[PDB]
Design a protein around this ligand. Structure first.
Ligand SMILES: *C(=N)c1cc(Oc2ccc(I)cc2)ncn1
Ligand SMILES: *C(=N)c1cc(Oc2ccc(I)cc2)ncn1
Ligand code: NA
Lengths: 301, 304
């Protein structure tokens, strides 16, 4: 028992992190097979930050303008191309530590581990969720760009995030590994702001199910709700709508605990109304929304 | 910006995890050089576990009773011995992935990363603190025994914890890598309970400094206090005493944010007395005590 924000073991990713330098700018890249993936904004200068023309900046570069260091070793760049907002540097050596991997684009509410890196070297690992407003609440300093997010769902690393920038609210924006941004963001230093963020209702419910599995019942009640009345109330606390898909997904947790999904929804309604009155749930005084239904089953049973 | 419970990258430890089987029990071992380290309770059956004589159970075992698997390879056990509550299995192959390492015993209040494992396969990594009552609030299922905790101090892995058991309250007990328990626990199935726990004052202050560095400032106030008056308040709220050494350790954070330790203690005083009045700090409605001063400096400075 116990319940912790748990990240995936980071070793498989650590063996892929390299440093990429262009001009005066160094950030991180991800070396898989014979390709290094990194944010295309590595090719920007001070002048290019508001309205970079990436095609025009990139045509002016040769392979030898890109310095890639993997640990103590320089890799030879032998090709370059851009896909959306990621740069792909072809290199003359396949990474012998390339894991089994795939690229997956995630939906809001999905969680992943982030391996934060500086100068191609891992600093730390933590768990994040893709917020409804398509930001993540990470921990990133200058030089962290090109750090990645991932899941490992057997021996296969699923890369789902690469870090590009910090927005003024202190939250973080990035792309999938095909270089498409999550959300309406662009790799320009124009004024951009995140939409107002909401709580990920399905994850909160999952976590309440985790509390039950770990032997905590104090917040249940004798009531039920319709899905529509739940959503009418939850919206007023800035909770995401719960859909029939969400209800279906909670089915296994429902069946394990003996508590119907709409019954757990009633419990949540009451918690929003009453707060916790000095009590905690799995060690928190707030309702946690960064554990998915899948995460709960994996960590509990 | 931002502040997260962050674990050390676990790759160097992942390469040391193996599976150990004895009879019907499988759990995890740590393979360094030519020795596999694991909980000595692996040798017990149900009936032994109530009152084990480990020396007597162990003398009955041959090397071939211990099956050690590192991935899909069997290692050959060529020796066995006990040190305190850890079993040491000599094997015929040195781990080619052995990192630079040391064995260290940590103090209550100190944090470390735990790599949770099942059948010798790392499953997850998280950050823990050694509670004042010498438990950890971990997340462990059956098969997790022999999972380890560690810090990385440069390129050197410092191993500080090996998981042995769960206590009835759902918290966790284990040893250092020399087999000495943290806390007043024994490796047997008897009623054992954690002492009442306290809050790690110095870490709470560290975390308040982290909040300030990230721009969360509403709890600062104009007041200061003395160590003695603060300690009278900490004692009242089941907080560990704050020592002069704690104050020294927070020195960097004090100088960086312009908030002296005893000034920040006056902030914490007020929070204990009045609560948070509907507000949060770094997204939490409780005072977090599982970041050390070092943890805060490391994460707000990008050490790698
Ligand atoms: C990444 N490691 C990083 C990014 C920044 O700022 C930045 C640069 C370009 C764009 I387009 C957006 C944001 N500063 C330091 N390090
Ligand atoms: C370790 N993987 C493990 C331990 C237990 O229970 C147990 C065994 C011996 C003692 I002494 C205490 C507790 N069950 C499953 N897995
Ligand atoms: Na003050």
């Amino acid at each position: 028992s116990g319940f912790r924000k748990m990240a995936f073991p980071s070793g498989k990713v650590e063996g892929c992190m390299v440093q990429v330098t262009c001009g005066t700018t160094t950030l991180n890249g991800l070396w898989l097979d014979d390709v290094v993936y990194c944010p295309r904004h590595v090719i920007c200068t001070s002048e290019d930050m508001l309205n970079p023309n990436y095609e025009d900046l990139l045509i002016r570069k040769s392979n030898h303008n890109f310095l890639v260091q993997a640990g103590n070793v320089q890799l030879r760049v032998i090709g370059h191309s851009m896909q959306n907002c990621v740069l792909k540097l072809k290199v003359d050596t396949a990474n012998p530590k390339t894991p089994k991997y795939k690229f997956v684009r995630i939906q809001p509410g999905q969680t992943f581990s982030v391996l934060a890196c500086y100068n191609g070297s891992p600093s730390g690992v933590y768990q994040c969720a893709m917020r409804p407003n398509f930001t993540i609440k990470g921990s990133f300093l200058n030089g962290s760009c090109g750090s990645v997010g991932f899941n490992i769902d057997y021996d296969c690393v699923s890369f789902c995030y690469m870090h590009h920038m910090e927005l003024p609210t202190g939250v973080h924006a990035g792309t999938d590994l095909e270089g498409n941004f999550y959300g309406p963001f662009v790799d320009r230093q124009t004024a951009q702001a995140a939409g107002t963020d909401t709580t990920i209702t399905v994850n909160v419910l999952a976590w309440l199910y985790a509390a039950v599995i770990n032997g905590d019942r104090w917040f249940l009640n004798r009531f039920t709700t319709t899905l529509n009345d739940f959503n009418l109330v939850a919206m007023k606390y800035n909770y995401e709508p719960l859909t029939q898909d969400h209800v279906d997904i909670l089915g296994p947790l429902s069946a394990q605990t003996g508590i119907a999904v709409l019954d757990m929804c009633a419990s949540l309604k009451e918690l929003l109304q009453n707060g916790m009155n000095g009590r905690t749930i799995l060690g928190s005084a707030l309702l946690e929304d960064e554990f998915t239904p899948f995460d709960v089953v994996r960590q509990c049973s």
